[PDB]
Amino acid sequence: MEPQEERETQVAAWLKKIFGDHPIPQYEVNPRTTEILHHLSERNRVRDRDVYLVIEDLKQKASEYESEAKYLQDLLMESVNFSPANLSSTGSRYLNALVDSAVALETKDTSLASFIPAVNDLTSDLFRTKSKSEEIKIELEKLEKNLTATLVLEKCLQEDVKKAELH
Amino acid sequence: PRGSSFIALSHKLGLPPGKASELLLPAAASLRQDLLLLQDQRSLWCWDL
Amino acid sequence: ELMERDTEAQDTAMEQARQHTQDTQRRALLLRAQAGAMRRQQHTLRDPM
Amino acid sequence: LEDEVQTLLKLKNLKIQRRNKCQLMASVTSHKSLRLNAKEEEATKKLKQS
Amino acid sequence: PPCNLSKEDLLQNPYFSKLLLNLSQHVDESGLSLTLAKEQAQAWKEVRLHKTTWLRSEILHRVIQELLVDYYVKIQDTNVTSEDKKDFVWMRARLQQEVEEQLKKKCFTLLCYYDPNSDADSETVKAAKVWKLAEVLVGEQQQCQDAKSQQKEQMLLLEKKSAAYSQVLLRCLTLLQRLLQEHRLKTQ
Amino acid sequence: VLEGENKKKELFLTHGNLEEVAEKLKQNISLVQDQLAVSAQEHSFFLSKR
């Protein structure tokens, strides 16, 4: 259980971390203001560490993909002497069509047997995501009529309070 | 077998099979970003409750 | 979903079968490459022999 | 209610029109898997006889 | 006790509200630092810049493997591609055009299954739809993700209107108990 | 990222362990959204009572 002194100490340490060159306005010294920002800072450090991990993972995987692309290219020339420039215009166009189709599918295996479940799932989830959202908008009218009837009842009952006071 | 482990991790993280294995970490953290996008709403359904 | 499971039972193993075929045929053709290379060694030694 | 019925009916119509497609896809996947299994045997015989 | 932030808690400490307003330019809806989001975007830019070449190189060798295994199947037929084991430049000259042929095979075969309207299409419109399939699937993915990204704000909307209904019902309960007890039960 | 700030790095990390951690995250998300739904239903029941 971090006390309010340690709470405000971590808040003061976090102020210069967040603002830096930005000016730091003064807060009212009460446990509420000190308490609320503590959880925000605690989860902000967690998510920033996680995003550090994601950024370093992306740079690492980009370097790995460069290394694997170079290795597979060298394997291509040492095996069948194949380069992307050897194919004709229609061959390069088909290659680029498969490249940006796989980009749209964000998949790794270019086999047709890997295309078919991904293509079927991409066809299906597009309508699945818009499915089941109709329940919200058909349940909305009951809450809307209840709130509207009770609101006009509220103003009617306020006028009833006034008229009952008159009576 | 590590490939089967990674596809199983994609299965348990909601990623479709055969997808980009390198987007596992951005998605799962986003799931954690979704996770923190839930429990606070739980408090919004609890304390006012 | 049942016959999707039936198809995925082969979808998982088709890449493994292709990898097994490629690796086994490469380690099989290196036997013939070895045979040629130390046939060359044989005839490199045999005429002086 | 009739609109709901016909939307489910056309949903199942497209489900059958992909059901036969899925039969075709299992067929071509099974043929390609058996193709790879038949590609294994050249590797085995080149590992044995050579 | 309103442990969560409320309007009463907002008006209790306006300085705290102005302090939290400065975090908006730093902490977004997801919570991330905006410069950390920009660094994530730049790392993803490196990822896509390298993966363009990676996907350019991967499908070439995959289609070479597919052509070689199709010629394996053709060895079992009458016309044997045995000269692939014999010649290298001849198999290269055949290999370029037949990698193109297998790319055509894969593209038109997949488009025969992707759309029933594209099942019996001619080769020119099939090729055009092969070129445009990337944009079609990007649009499909975007429209798929739009509803899932959308649903959160209607969930919050129904939740807050549900709480507003509770506030209105509490006010009505107070007014009705005033009308019954104070105006009718005791005084009257 | 998946285990987070709750615990540090383990002495022996296996892919089955990370599979279990991913299942833990998915189960946490599912239980939290189920609690969200049941809390909304409970507050709506008290709304109907009011």
Coordinates of C-alpha atoms in Angstrom, one line a residue:
Chain A
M1 CA 0.0 0.0 0.0
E2 CA 1.8 3.1 -1.3
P3 CA 1.1 6.0 1.1
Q4 CA 0.1 9.5 0.0
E5 CA 3.7 10.7 0.5
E6 CA 5.1 8.1 -1.8
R7 CA 2.1 8.6 -4.1
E8 CA 2.9 12.3 -4.5
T9 CA 6.6 11.5 -4.8
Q10 CA 5.9 9.2 -7.8
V11 CA 3.5 11.9 -9.2
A12 CA 6.3 14.5 -8.9
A13 CA 8.7 12.1 -10.6
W14 CA 6.2 11.4 -13.3
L15 CA 5.4 15.1 -13.9
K16 CA 8.9 15.9 -15.3
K17 CA 8.8 12.6 -17.2
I18 CA 5.6 13.5 -19.0
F19 CA 5.8 17.3 -19.4
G20 CA 9.5 17.7 -19.8
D21 CA 9.8 21.0 -21.5
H22 CA 6.1 21.6 -21.0
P23 CA 5.2 23.7 -17.9
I24 CA 3.6 21.9 -14.9
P25 CA 0.5 23.5 -13.5
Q26 CA -0.3 23.2 -9.8
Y27 CA -2.8 20.7 -8.4
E28 CA -5.0 20.9 -5.3
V29 CA -3.5 18.8 -2.6
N30 CA -6.2 16.2 -1.9
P31 CA -6.1 12.4 -1.9
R32 CA -8.6 12.2 -4.9
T33 CA -6.3 14.0 -7.4
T34 CA -3.2 12.1 -6.2
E35 CA -5.1 8.8 -6.3
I36 CA -6.6 9.0 -9.8
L37 CA -3.4 9.8 -11.8
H38 CA -1.5 7.0 -10.0
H39 CA -3.4 4.2 -11.9
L40 CA -3.0 6.2 -15.1
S41 CA 0.8 6.4 -14.7
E42 CA 1.0 2.7 -13.6
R43 CA -0.8 1.5 -16.7
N44 CA 1.0 4.1 -18.9
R45 CA 4.4 2.7 -17.9
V46 CA 3.1 -0.9 -18.7
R47 CA 1.7 0.0 -22.1
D48 CA 4.8 2.1 -23.0
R49 CA 7.1 -0.8 -22.1
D50 CA 4.9 -3.2 -24.1
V51 CA 5.0 -0.8 -27.1
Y52 CA 8.8 -0.6 -26.7
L53 CA 8.8 -4.4 -27.0
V54 CA 6.5 -4.2 -30.1
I55 CA 8.7 -1.5 -31.8
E56 CA 11.9 -3.5 -31.1
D57 CA 10.2 -6.6 -32.3
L58 CA 9.2 -4.9 -35.6
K59 CA 12.7 -3.6 -36.2
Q60 CA 14.1 -7.1 -35.4
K61 CA 11.7 -8.9 -37.6
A62 CA 12.4 -6.4 -40.4
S63 CA 16.1 -7.2 -40.2
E64 CA 15.2 -10.9 -40.1
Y65 CA 13.1 -10.6 -43.2
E66 CA 15.9 -8.8 -45.0
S67 CA 18.3 -11.6 -44.0
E68 CA 15.9 -14.3 -45.1
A69 CA 15.1 -12.5 -48.4
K70 CA 18.8 -12.3 -49.2
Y71 CA 19.4 -16.0 -48.2
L72 CA 16.5 -17.2 -50.4
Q73 CA 17.7 -15.0 -53.3
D74 CA 21.2 -16.5 -53.0
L75 CA 19.6 -20.0 -52.8
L76 CA 17.6 -19.1 -56.0
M77 CA 20.7 -18.2 -58.0
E78 CA 22.7 -21.1 -56.7
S79 CA 19.9 -23.6 -57.4
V80 CA 18.2 -22.6 -60.7
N81 CA 19.8 -19.2 -61.4
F82 CA 16.5 -17.5 -60.9
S83 CA 16.1 -13.7 -60.3
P84 CA 12.9 -11.5 -60.3
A85 CA 14.2 -9.6 -63.4
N86 CA 14.3 -12.8 -65.6
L87 CA 10.5 -13.0 -65.8
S88 CA 8.6 -11.1 -68.5
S89 CA 6.1 -8.3 -68.1
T90 CA 3.2 -10.7 -67.5
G91 CA 5.2 -12.9 -65.2
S92 CA 6.3 -9.9 -63.1
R93 CA 2.7 -8.7 -63.1
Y94 CA 1.4 -12.1 -61.9
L95 CA 4.2 -12.1 -59.2
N96 CA 3.2 -8.6 -58.0
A97 CA -0.5 -9.5 -58.1
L98 CA 0.3 -12.5 -55.8
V99 CA 2.5 -10.2 -53.6
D100 CA -0.2 -7.6 -53.0
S101 CA -2.9 -10.2 -52.7
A102 CA -0.8 -11.8 -49.9
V103 CA -0.4 -8.2 -48.5
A104 CA -4.2 -7.9 -48.5
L105 CA -4.5 -11.3 -46.9
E106 CA -1.5 -10.7 -44.5
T107 CA -0.5 -14.4 -44.9
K108 CA 2.8 -16.2 -45.0
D109 CA 2.0 -19.4 -47.0
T110 CA 1.3 -18.8 -50.7
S111 CA -0.1 -22.3 -51.3
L112 CA -3.6 -22.5 -52.7
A113 CA -4.4 -24.9 -49.8
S114 CA -3.5 -22.0 -47.6
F115 CA -5.4 -19.5 -49.7
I116 CA -8.7 -21.2 -49.5
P117 CA -9.4 -21.2 -45.7
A118 CA -8.1 -17.7 -45.5
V119 CA -10.2 -16.5 -48.4
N120 CA -13.3 -18.3 -47.0
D121 CA -12.7 -16.8 -43.6
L122 CA -12.2 -13.3 -45.0
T123 CA -15.4 -13.7 -46.9
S124 CA -17.2 -14.9 -43.8
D125 CA -16.0 -12.6 -41.1
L126 CA -16.8 -9.5 -43.2
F127 CA -20.5 -10.3 -42.7
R128 CA -20.0 -11.9 -39.3
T129 CA -18.7 -8.6 -37.8
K130 CA -21.7 -6.7 -39.0
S131 CA -23.9 -9.6 -37.8
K132 CA -25.2 -9.6 -34.2
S133 CA -25.0 -5.7 -34.1
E134 CA -28.8 -5.5 -35.0
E135 CA -29.6 -6.7 -31.5
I136 CA -28.3 -3.4 -30.1
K137 CA -30.4 -1.2 -32.3
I138 CA -33.5 -3.3 -31.8
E139 CA -33.0 -3.2 -28.0
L140 CA -32.4 0.6 -28.3
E141 CA -36.0 1.5 -28.9
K142 CA -37.2 0.0 -25.6
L143 CA -34.7 2.0 -23.6
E144 CA -35.5 5.1 -25.7
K145 CA -39.3 4.9 -25.1
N146 CA -38.7 4.1 -21.4
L147 CA -36.4 7.1 -21.0
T148 CA -38.6 9.5 -23.0
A149 CA -41.8 8.4 -21.2
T150 CA -40.1 8.7 -17.8
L151 CA -38.6 12.1 -18.7
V152 CA -42.0 13.6 -19.7
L153 CA -43.3 11.9 -16.5
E154 CA -40.5 13.6 -14.6
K155 CA -41.5 17.0 -15.8
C156 CA -45.2 16.2 -15.3
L157 CA -44.4 15.1 -11.7
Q158 CA -42.4 18.2 -11.0
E159 CA -45.4 20.2 -12.1
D160 CA -47.5 17.8 -10.0
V161 CA -45.3 18.7 -7.0
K162 CA -45.9 22.4 -7.6
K163 CA -49.6 22.0 -8.1
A164 CA -49.8 19.7 -5.0
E165 CA -48.0 22.4 -3.0
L166 CA -50.6 24.9 -4.3
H167 CA -53.5 22.6 -3.3
Chain B
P1 CA 7.2 -28.1 -34.5
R2 CA 7.9 -24.5 -33.4
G3 CA 5.8 -23.5 -36.4
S4 CA 2.9 -25.6 -35.1
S5 CA 3.4 -23.9 -31.7
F6 CA 3.3 -20.4 -33.3
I7 CA 0.1 -21.3 -35.3
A8 CA -1.4 -22.6 -32.0
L9 CA -0.4 -19.3 -30.4
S10 CA -2.2 -17.5 -33.3
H11 CA -5.2 -19.7 -32.6
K12 CA -5.3 -18.8 -28.9
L13 CA -4.7 -15.1 -29.6
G14 CA -7.6 -14.8 -32.1
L15 CA -5.5 -14.5 -35.2
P16 CA -6.7 -16.6 -38.1
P17 CA -4.5 -19.6 -39.1
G18 CA -1.8 -19.0 -41.7
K19 CA -1.7 -15.3 -41.1
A20 CA 1.3 -13.0 -40.5
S21 CA 3.2 -14.6 -37.6
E22 CA 5.1 -11.3 -37.0
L23 CA 1.8 -9.4 -36.2
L24 CA 1.3 -11.7 -33.2
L25 CA 2.9 -9.2 -30.8
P26 CA 1.2 -6.0 -32.1
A27 CA -2.2 -7.8 -32.0
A28 CA -1.9 -9.4 -28.5
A29 CA -0.7 -6.1 -27.0
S30 CA -3.7 -4.5 -28.8
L31 CA -5.7 -7.2 -27.1
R32 CA -4.1 -6.0 -23.9
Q33 CA -5.0 -2.5 -25.2
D34 CA -8.5 -4.0 -25.5
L35 CA -8.1 -5.5 -22.0
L36 CA -7.5 -2.1 -20.5
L37 CA -10.4 -0.9 -22.7
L38 CA -12.7 -3.3 -20.7
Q39 CA -12.0 -3.3 -17.0
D40 CA -12.2 0.4 -16.6
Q41 CA -15.7 0.2 -18.2
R42 CA -16.3 -2.5 -15.6
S43 CA -15.6 0.1 -12.9
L44 CA -18.0 2.4 -14.8
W45 CA -20.6 -0.4 -14.5
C46 CA -19.6 -1.1 -10.8
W47 CA -18.9 2.0 -8.7
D48 CA -21.9 3.9 -10.2
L49 CA -23.8 0.6 -9.5
Chain C
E1 CA -16.8 -27.0 -39.5
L2 CA -16.5 -30.8 -39.3
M3 CA -15.4 -31.2 -42.9
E4 CA -13.3 -28.1 -42.4
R5 CA -11.5 -30.0 -39.7
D6 CA -11.3 -32.9 -42.2
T7 CA -9.6 -30.6 -44.7
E8 CA -7.3 -29.0 -42.1
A9 CA -6.1 -32.5 -41.1
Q10 CA -4.4 -32.5 -44.5
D11 CA -3.7 -28.7 -44.6
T12 CA -1.4 -29.0 -41.5
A13 CA 0.5 -32.0 -42.9
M14 CA 0.9 -31.0 -46.6
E15 CA 3.7 -28.6 -45.8
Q16 CA 5.4 -31.2 -43.7
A17 CA 5.1 -33.8 -46.5
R18 CA 6.5 -31.3 -49.0
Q19 CA 9.4 -30.6 -46.6
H20 CA 10.1 -34.3 -46.1
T21 CA 10.0 -34.9 -49.8
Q22 CA 12.4 -32.0 -50.6
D23 CA 14.8 -32.8 -47.7
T24 CA 14.8 -36.6 -48.5
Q25 CA 15.4 -36.0 -52.2
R26 CA 18.2 -33.6 -51.5
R27 CA 19.9 -36.0 -49.1
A28 CA 19.3 -38.7 -51.7
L29 CA 20.9 -36.7 -54.6
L30 CA 23.9 -35.9 -52.4
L31 CA 24.5 -39.7 -52.4
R32 CA 24.9 -39.5 -56.2
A33 CA 26.9 -36.3 -55.9
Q34 CA 29.2 -38.1 -53.5
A35 CA 29.4 -41.1 -55.8
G36 CA 30.5 -38.8 -58.7
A37 CA 33.0 -36.9 -56.5
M38 CA 34.8 -39.9 -55.2
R39 CA 34.6 -41.5 -58.6
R40 CA 36.6 -38.5 -59.6
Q41 CA 38.9 -39.3 -56.7
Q42 CA 39.0 -42.9 -57.9
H43 CA 40.1 -42.0 -61.4
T44 CA 42.5 -39.3 -60.0
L45 CA 44.3 -42.1 -58.1
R46 CA 43.7 -45.0 -60.5
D47 CA 45.7 -43.9 -63.5
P48 CA 48.7 -43.2 -61.3
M49 CA 47.8 -46.5 -59.6
Chain D
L1 CA -40.9 -12.4 -40.6
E2 CA -41.0 -13.4 -44.3
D3 CA -38.0 -11.1 -44.9
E4 CA -36.1 -12.9 -42.1
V5 CA -37.1 -16.3 -43.6
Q6 CA -35.9 -15.4 -47.1
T7 CA -32.7 -13.9 -45.8
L8 CA -31.9 -17.1 -44.0
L9 CA -33.0 -19.0 -47.1
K10 CA -30.6 -17.1 -49.4
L11 CA -27.9 -17.5 -46.7
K12 CA -28.3 -21.3 -46.8
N13 CA -28.5 -21.0 -50.7
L14 CA -25.1 -19.4 -50.7
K15 CA -24.0 -22.0 -48.0
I16 CA -24.9 -24.8 -50.4
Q17 CA -23.3 -22.9 -53.3
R18 CA -20.1 -22.8 -51.2
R19 CA -20.8 -26.4 -49.9
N20 CA -20.2 -27.9 -53.4
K21 CA -17.2 -25.5 -53.7
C22 CA -15.9 -26.9 -50.4
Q23 CA -16.3 -30.5 -51.8
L24 CA -14.2 -29.3 -54.8
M25 CA -11.6 -27.8 -52.4
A26 CA -11.3 -31.0 -50.3
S27 CA -10.9 -32.9 -53.6
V28 CA -8.1 -30.7 -54.9
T29 CA -6.4 -30.6 -51.5
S30 CA -6.6 -34.4 -51.2
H31 CA -5.2 -34.8 -54.7
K32 CA -2.3 -32.4 -54.0
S33 CA -1.5 -34.1 -50.7
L34 CA -1.5 -37.5 -52.5
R35 CA 0.7 -35.9 -55.1
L36 CA 3.2 -34.9 -52.4
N37 CA 3.0 -38.4 -50.9
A38 CA 3.8 -39.8 -54.4
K39 CA 6.7 -37.3 -54.6
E40 CA 8.1 -38.9 -51.4
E41 CA 8.7 -42.2 -53.2
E42 CA 11.3 -40.8 -55.7
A43 CA 13.2 -39.5 -52.7
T44 CA 13.1 -42.9 -51.0
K45 CA 14.1 -44.8 -54.1
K46 CA 17.0 -42.4 -54.8
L47 CA 18.0 -42.8 -51.1
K48 CA 18.0 -46.6 -51.5
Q49 CA 19.2 -47.5 -55.0
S50 CA 21.9 -44.8 -55.4
Chain E
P1 CA -18.1 6.7 -3.5
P2 CA -17.3 7.8 -7.1
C3 CA -13.9 6.1 -7.5
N4 CA -14.2 6.5 -11.2
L5 CA -14.0 10.0 -12.7
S6 CA -17.4 11.7 -12.6
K7 CA -18.8 15.2 -13.3
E8 CA -18.8 16.0 -9.6
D9 CA -15.2 14.8 -9.5
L10 CA -14.5 17.0 -12.5
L11 CA -15.9 20.1 -10.9
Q12 CA -14.3 19.3 -7.5
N13 CA -10.8 20.0 -8.9
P14 CA -10.7 22.1 -12.1
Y15 CA -6.9 22.2 -11.9
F16 CA -6.8 18.4 -12.0
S17 CA -9.1 18.5 -15.1
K18 CA -6.7 21.0 -16.8
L19 CA -3.8 18.7 -15.9
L20 CA -5.6 15.7 -17.4
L21 CA -6.4 17.8 -20.5
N22 CA -2.6 18.1 -21.1
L23 CA -2.3 14.3 -21.1
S24 CA -4.7 14.2 -24.2
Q25 CA -1.9 15.4 -26.5
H26 CA 0.3 12.6 -25.0
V27 CA -2.2 9.8 -24.1
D28 CA -4.6 8.9 -26.8
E29 CA -7.7 6.6 -26.7
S30 CA -5.5 3.5 -26.8
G31 CA -3.2 5.1 -24.1
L32 CA 0.0 5.3 -26.2
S33 CA 2.4 8.2 -26.5
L34 CA 1.9 9.8 -29.9
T35 CA 5.6 9.8 -30.6
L36 CA 5.7 6.2 -29.6
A37 CA 2.9 5.6 -32.0
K38 CA 5.0 7.4 -34.7
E39 CA 8.0 5.2 -33.8
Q40 CA 5.7 2.1 -34.2
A41 CA 4.6 3.4 -37.6
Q42 CA 8.2 3.9 -38.7
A43 CA 9.2 0.4 -37.5
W44 CA 6.2 -0.9 -39.5
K45 CA 7.4 1.2 -42.5
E46 CA 10.7 -0.7 -42.2
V47 CA 8.7 -3.9 -41.9
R48 CA 6.7 -3.3 -45.1
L49 CA 9.7 -2.0 -47.0
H50 CA 11.6 -5.2 -46.3
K51 CA 8.6 -7.5 -46.6
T52 CA 7.9 -6.2 -50.1
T53 CA 11.2 -7.7 -51.3
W54 CA 10.6 -10.7 -49.0
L55 CA 7.2 -11.5 -50.7
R56 CA 8.7 -10.7 -54.1
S57 CA 11.3 -13.4 -53.5
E58 CA 9.1 -16.0 -51.7
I59 CA 6.5 -16.5 -54.3
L60 CA 9.1 -17.0 -57.1
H61 CA 10.6 -20.0 -55.4
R62 CA 7.2 -21.3 -54.3
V63 CA 6.0 -21.3 -57.9
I64 CA 9.2 -22.9 -59.0
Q65 CA 8.6 -25.7 -56.5
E66 CA 4.9 -25.9 -57.7
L67 CA 6.1 -26.2 -61.3
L68 CA 8.7 -28.8 -60.4
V69 CA 6.1 -30.9 -58.5
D70 CA 3.6 -30.5 -61.4
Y71 CA 6.4 -31.9 -63.7
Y72 CA 6.8 -34.7 -61.2
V73 CA 3.2 -35.5 -61.7
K74 CA 3.8 -35.3 -65.5
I75 CA 6.6 -37.8 -65.3
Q76 CA 4.0 -40.3 -64.1
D77 CA 2.1 -39.4 -67.3
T78 CA 3.3 -40.2 -70.9
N79 CA 5.3 -37.0 -71.5
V80 CA 8.3 -37.1 -69.2
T81 CA 10.3 -34.0 -68.2
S82 CA 13.4 -36.0 -67.8
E83 CA 15.5 -33.4 -69.6
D84 CA 15.2 -31.2 -66.6
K85 CA 17.7 -33.6 -65.0
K86 CA 19.8 -33.4 -68.2
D87 CA 19.9 -29.8 -69.4
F88 CA 20.2 -26.6 -67.4
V89 CA 19.9 -23.7 -69.8
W90 CA 17.1 -25.5 -71.7
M91 CA 15.3 -26.1 -68.4
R92 CA 15.9 -22.5 -67.5
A93 CA 14.3 -21.3 -70.8
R94 CA 11.4 -23.6 -70.2
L95 CA 11.4 -22.6 -66.5
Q96 CA 10.8 -18.9 -66.9
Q97 CA 7.8 -19.3 -69.2
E98 CA 6.4 -22.1 -67.1
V99 CA 6.7 -20.2 -63.9
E100 CA 4.6 -17.7 -65.7
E101 CA 2.3 -20.5 -66.7
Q102 CA 2.0 -21.8 -63.2
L103 CA 1.3 -18.2 -61.9
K104 CA -1.5 -18.0 -64.5
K105 CA -2.7 -21.4 -63.3
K106 CA -2.8 -20.4 -59.7
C107 CA -4.4 -17.0 -60.4
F108 CA -7.2 -18.2 -62.7
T109 CA -7.8 -21.4 -60.6
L110 CA -8.2 -19.3 -57.4
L111 CA -10.4 -16.8 -59.2
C112 CA -12.6 -19.6 -60.5
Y113 CA -13.4 -20.3 -56.8
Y114 CA -13.3 -16.8 -55.2
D115 CA -16.4 -15.5 -57.0
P116 CA -19.1 -17.5 -58.8
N117 CA -19.4 -14.5 -61.2
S118 CA -15.6 -15.0 -61.8
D119 CA -15.9 -18.8 -62.2
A120 CA -16.8 -18.7 -65.9
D121 CA -15.2 -15.3 -66.7
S122 CA -13.0 -14.8 -69.7
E123 CA -9.2 -14.6 -69.3
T124 CA -8.9 -10.8 -69.8
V125 CA -11.5 -9.9 -67.1
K126 CA -10.0 -12.7 -64.9
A127 CA -6.6 -11.1 -65.2
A128 CA -8.0 -7.6 -64.4
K129 CA -9.8 -9.0 -61.3
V130 CA -6.5 -10.7 -60.4
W131 CA -4.8 -7.3 -60.5
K132 CA -7.6 -5.7 -58.5
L133 CA -8.1 -8.5 -56.0
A134 CA -5.6 -6.9 -53.6
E135 CA -7.7 -3.7 -53.4
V136 CA -10.9 -5.9 -53.2
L137 CA -9.6 -7.8 -50.2
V138 CA -8.2 -4.6 -48.6
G139 CA -11.7 -3.1 -48.8
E140 CA -13.2 -6.4 -47.4
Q141 CA -10.8 -6.3 -44.5
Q142 CA -11.5 -2.6 -43.8
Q143 CA -15.3 -3.1 -43.9
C144 CA -14.8 -6.1 -41.7
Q145 CA -12.8 -4.2 -39.1
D146 CA -15.0 -1.2 -39.2
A147 CA -18.0 -2.8 -37.4
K148 CA -15.7 -4.2 -34.6
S149 CA -14.1 -0.8 -34.1
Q150 CA -17.5 0.8 -34.3
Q151 CA -19.4 -1.3 -31.7
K152 CA -17.5 0.1 -28.6
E153 CA -18.9 3.6 -28.9
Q154 CA -22.5 2.3 -29.1
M155 CA -21.8 0.1 -26.1
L156 CA -20.7 3.2 -24.2
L157 CA -23.7 5.1 -25.6
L158 CA -26.2 2.5 -24.4
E159 CA -24.4 2.2 -21.0
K160 CA -24.4 6.0 -20.4
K161 CA -28.1 6.3 -21.5
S162 CA -28.8 3.3 -19.2
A163 CA -27.3 5.2 -16.3
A164 CA -29.2 8.4 -17.4
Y165 CA -32.4 6.4 -17.2
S166 CA -31.4 5.4 -13.6
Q167 CA -30.9 9.1 -12.7
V168 CA -34.3 10.0 -14.2
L169 CA -36.0 7.2 -12.3
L170 CA -34.3 8.3 -9.1
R171 CA -35.6 11.8 -9.6
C172 CA -39.1 10.4 -10.4
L173 CA -38.9 8.3 -7.2
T174 CA -38.0 11.3 -5.1
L175 CA -40.8 13.4 -6.6
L176 CA -43.4 10.6 -6.2
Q177 CA -42.4 10.0 -2.6
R178 CA -42.7 13.7 -2.0
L179 CA -46.1 13.7 -3.6
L180 CA -47.3 10.7 -1.6
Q181 CA -45.8 11.2 1.9
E182 CA -45.4 14.9 2.2
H183 CA -48.4 16.1 0.1
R184 CA -50.9 13.3 0.6
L185 CA -50.0 11.0 3.5
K186 CA -49.1 13.4 6.3
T187 CA -50.4 16.9 5.4
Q188 CA -53.6 16.0 3.6
Chain F
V1 CA 4.0 -8.3 -23.1
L2 CA 1.5 -11.2 -22.6
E3 CA 2.4 -11.9 -18.9
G4 CA 3.1 -8.2 -18.4
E5 CA 4.1 -6.6 -15.1
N6 CA 2.6 -9.4 -13.0
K7 CA 5.7 -11.6 -13.2
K8 CA 9.2 -11.4 -14.6
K9 CA 11.0 -13.8 -17.0
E10 CA 10.9 -17.5 -16.0
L11 CA 14.0 -19.7 -15.7
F12 CA 12.7 -22.1 -18.4
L13 CA 10.4 -20.7 -21.1
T14 CA 8.5 -23.1 -23.2
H15 CA 6.1 -22.5 -26.1
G16 CA 3.4 -24.4 -24.3
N17 CA 3.8 -22.0 -21.4
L18 CA 3.3 -19.1 -23.7
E19 CA 0.3 -20.9 -25.2
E20 CA -1.1 -21.1 -21.7
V21 CA -0.4 -17.4 -21.1
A22 CA -2.2 -16.5 -24.4
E23 CA -5.1 -18.7 -23.2
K24 CA -5.0 -16.8 -19.9
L25 CA -5.3 -13.4 -21.7
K26 CA -8.2 -14.7 -23.8
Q27 CA -10.0 -16.1 -20.8
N28 CA -9.5 -12.9 -18.9
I29 CA -11.0 -10.9 -21.8
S30 CA -13.9 -13.3 -22.0
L31 CA -14.6 -13.3 -18.3
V32 CA -14.4 -9.5 -18.2
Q33 CA -16.8 -9.0 -21.1
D34 CA -19.2 -11.6 -19.5
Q35 CA -19.0 -9.6 -16.3
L36 CA -19.8 -6.5 -18.4
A37 CA -22.8 -8.1 -19.9
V38 CA -24.2 -9.5 -16.6
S39 CA -23.6 -6.1 -14.8
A40 CA -25.5 -4.4 -17.6
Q41 CA -28.3 -7.0 -17.2
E42 CA -28.4 -6.5 -13.4
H43 CA -28.6 -2.7 -13.7
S44 CA -31.3 -3.1 -16.4
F45 CA -33.3 -5.3 -14.0
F46 CA -33.0 -2.6 -11.3
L47 CA -34.0 -0.1 -14.0
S48 CA -37.2 -2.1 -14.6
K49 CA -37.8 -2.3 -10.9
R50 CA -37.5 1.5 -10.6

